Design a protein around this nucleic acid. Structure first.
Lengths: 149, 77
RNA sequence: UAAGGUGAUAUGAACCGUUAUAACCGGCGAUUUCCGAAUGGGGAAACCCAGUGUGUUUCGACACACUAUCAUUAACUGAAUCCAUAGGUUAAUGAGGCGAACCGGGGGAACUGAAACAUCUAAGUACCCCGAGGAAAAGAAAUCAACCGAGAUUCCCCCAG
RNA sequence: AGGGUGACAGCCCCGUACACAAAAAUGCACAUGCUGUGAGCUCGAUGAGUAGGGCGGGACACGUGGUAUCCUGUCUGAAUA
RNA sequence: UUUUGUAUAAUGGGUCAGCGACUUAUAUUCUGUAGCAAGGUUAACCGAAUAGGGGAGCCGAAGGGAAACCGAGUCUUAACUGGGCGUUAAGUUGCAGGGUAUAGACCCGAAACCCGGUGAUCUAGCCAUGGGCAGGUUGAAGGUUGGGUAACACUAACUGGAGGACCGAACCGACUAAUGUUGAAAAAUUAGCGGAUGACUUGUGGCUGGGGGUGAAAGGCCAAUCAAACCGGGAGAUAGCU
RNA sequence: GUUUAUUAAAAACACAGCACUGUGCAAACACGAAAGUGGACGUAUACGGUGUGACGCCUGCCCGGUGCCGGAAGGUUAAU
RNA sequence: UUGAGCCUUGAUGUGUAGGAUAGGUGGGAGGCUUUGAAGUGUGGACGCCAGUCUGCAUGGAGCCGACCUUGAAAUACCACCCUUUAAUGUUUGAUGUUCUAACGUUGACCCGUAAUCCGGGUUGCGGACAGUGUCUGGUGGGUAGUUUGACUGGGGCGGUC
RNA sequence: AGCUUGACUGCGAGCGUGACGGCGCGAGCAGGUGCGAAAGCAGGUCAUAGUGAUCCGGUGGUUCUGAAUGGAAGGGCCAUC
């Protein structure tokens, strides 16, 4: 018997594939409990059809959107002038909150949840880098010069 | 009577032959079993007296097509 | 068609008719008790007992019609259970039983013969059962043939004991 | 032809040969009206638990035999111009 | 008639009259006869239809060999002085007849086997529902009251009415004898005989069916039939026998 | 008590009683192609089969043969 | 829990000439080393206990091909492999426990239904068993069909053919 | 006692004997052989018993057949169980 699964089924299941099974197991258990359907031509073509297509669409859309995000702002530079004092050590330290909306005003619209901070609360006046996680593998690195006003 | 409801298998007749070829009448009987078939399109169990190759042909043709044949030839299920 | 008739044993009585509505012959109608598939329920066949509806200017009793089962179809209802199926009620259509042989199919002997008997024969005969028709069945090559060809089925004469 | 008539009838009677006859109901055959039904053309398809097999039995003139072929009770099982 | 042999006291027949047994079909062989003759003849069928067509076929003119094959020869065998079978003589189609074969096969006759039905109004068992058993004896258990015991046990009188109990009619049966035995009767009569409240008997209805029933068992009974009912059919079974 | 209706009424059959054996209930067993039914609306103190046949005293030895019951090691052993 | 097959891969295999617990074949003379060396402490795998292999490390950076006694060359490199074994993955069978989902239910309850049939529903129990079909061995006078010679101073018994 | 395989193969005039099936005797012809110098003798044993039809089938040989054709299977024929 050549049933097509519809479930996780214990020792043979992978949610819609082809298995060779005994007949008693098929008509007495699998078929009435949901769980399976026999491979009788048209259905196996049709069931496959949408499922195979599904895999192609989701992956491609995700990759493309993320590559596009990585590409965004062409200047790749966000500058900020925050209140400070004499020779370094600024008054109020910026965070990931401040920059998340600052980049919105000058390019990329990335939120607080996707910016990686190796510098922490960034308490230094100099050249800094905020590497974005536009995707799990794609990194969008925008250079930042912090000005001590 | 011992008729398969799918394939229509009556008991037929024959001979016990022996080593001395003595002909005796016998009956060959079908392998009739009373099995309860789930139909998904109706969401019910229709119980039939099938042969054990009426179950083969139900496994191949599907139960719906078979029930359409029984309803077609007036076999009541 | 008609000058004679009212069937026979079977005569009588009482009448009908003779130029056309006597009688006789034919076509189509009408009536067609009761039993019988018998069909409203029952039953020891030719009998017993009903229900429902319609009508009956003495409607305290009558008359008429319908009411079997099954199959198919439709409508209205309808459980365990919600939907639904089973079931129930009504209506429409059809069937049912008989018949001599022929026909197809499902079953299927034995005596007998073998100079015994068991394989074999008798014999797929007798018989039983189902079904159909005026015929049935079969039938339009997944058939033969044989390197040539034939062209569905059925029946008859050979082939050929 | 035949039958009857008081014995054996061509010409006595009924008939026979032959020639005609239907108000009505019908069977068959043409013609025709309506309804249903579908012609013809191009292209495509061209019958699966089936053929075949194992076991048991039956039908084929053919008794399992070296036994083709057909049918199938049981277990299986293709290729598909 | 059957026999070695029948007046035979072996079979058959009372007599008469009527009926009563070698047939029919289809094949094959031989004889007679008729036609044609190295040829004879058609079958189905068409049909002006016993004509005429129809020569499909069959038989004959060529055999030998298992067969290929050869052919007035052939087979055997490595081959035959040889040997086997042929050569050297007319057949064929009707009609009539004698045999033969297949059919009931000259006629009559079994016991029996099988198939389908009808029978439990008789009888056998069982089921249901109603009846029957005059009259007379015997006197169990129990009980009551006395006696008796520690209480029982036990014991006596009275009561009581058990029992496939006793005697005996109806009722059921059938042990003996005689009669009867072409009966009064296809199983009885007469005189005695057994049971007779029970495992009894009986009425009405029902149920069981043929290799089946039922059987307190005899192979008994199942409609005067029973080591396998009756009816109808296979069926004219078969009969080396009369 | 019963039996050969119609030549046998008996010592034969039956019997209470005894024993052996099967049977755990959808019982064994029987009729039935099957469904079902009887066993029994019973349940092992019950039911079926077989023998013996009130009661009394008793019922001895033999398991090699045939059967039955039990065993599973080995030999042989079908379809496949 | 138990066998085989296969893949990768690592081992495995002393007439005797002889430094060699070397099977064949075969292209080839550099492999080899600091992606941290020979030799050794030591345990284990292996054992015809002859002598391989080898985790870590003191040590510390070299070891060796044609050469040579051989039927053969040096698993120093490699390829294809026979025997024998080691680990993994994988491919299937076997057995036992456990499970619920087929089937059985002559358990209980509900419904068709004013019904100890039947069917359907809920649930309990049993459950791949039982049961039935085809095939097959055994048993099988429970039943059926039959056979059971002739001669013979009647037949049987004896004898004979 | 020496040497040997005639305990040959194909045939067979003619006879005997049986109802038949069958059985028996056989000079001679051909091929090849043994013994003998040779004439010759040898197709089992001094003779008469020592046996079993047909069917079915087994083994060896032989294209004789071989259901389209080439083979083969099966059959035939010869030997034989």
């Amino acid at each position: 018997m050549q049933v097509i699964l519809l479930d996780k089924v214990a020792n043979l299941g992978s949610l819609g594939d082809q298995v060779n099974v005994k007949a008693g197991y098929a008509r007495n258990f699998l078929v009435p409990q949901g769980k399976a359907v026999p491979a009788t031509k048209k259905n196996i073509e049709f069931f496959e059809a949408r499922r195979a297509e599904l895999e192609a669409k989701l992956a491609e859309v995700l990759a493309a959107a993320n590559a596009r995000a990585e590409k965004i702002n062409a200047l790749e530079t966000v500058t900020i002038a925050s209140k400070a004092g004499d020779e370094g050590k600024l008054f109020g330290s910026i965070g990931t909150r401040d920059i998340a909306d600052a980049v919105t005003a000058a390019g990329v619209e990335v939120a607080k949840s996707e910016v990686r901070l190796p510098n922490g609360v960034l308490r230094t006046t100099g050249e800094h880098e905020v590497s974005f996680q536009v995707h799990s593998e794609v990194f969008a690195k925008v250079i930042v010069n912090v000005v001590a006003e | 009577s011992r008729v398969c409801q799918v394939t229509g298998k009556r008991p037929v007749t024959g001979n016990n032959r022996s080593h001395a070829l003595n002909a005796t009448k016998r009956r060959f009987l079908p392998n009739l079993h009373s099995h309860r078939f789930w139909v998904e399109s109706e969401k019910r169990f229709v119980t039939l007296r099938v042969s054990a190759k009426g179950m083969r042909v139900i496994d191949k043709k599907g139960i719906d097509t078979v029930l359409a044949e029984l309803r077609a030839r007036g076999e009541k299920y």
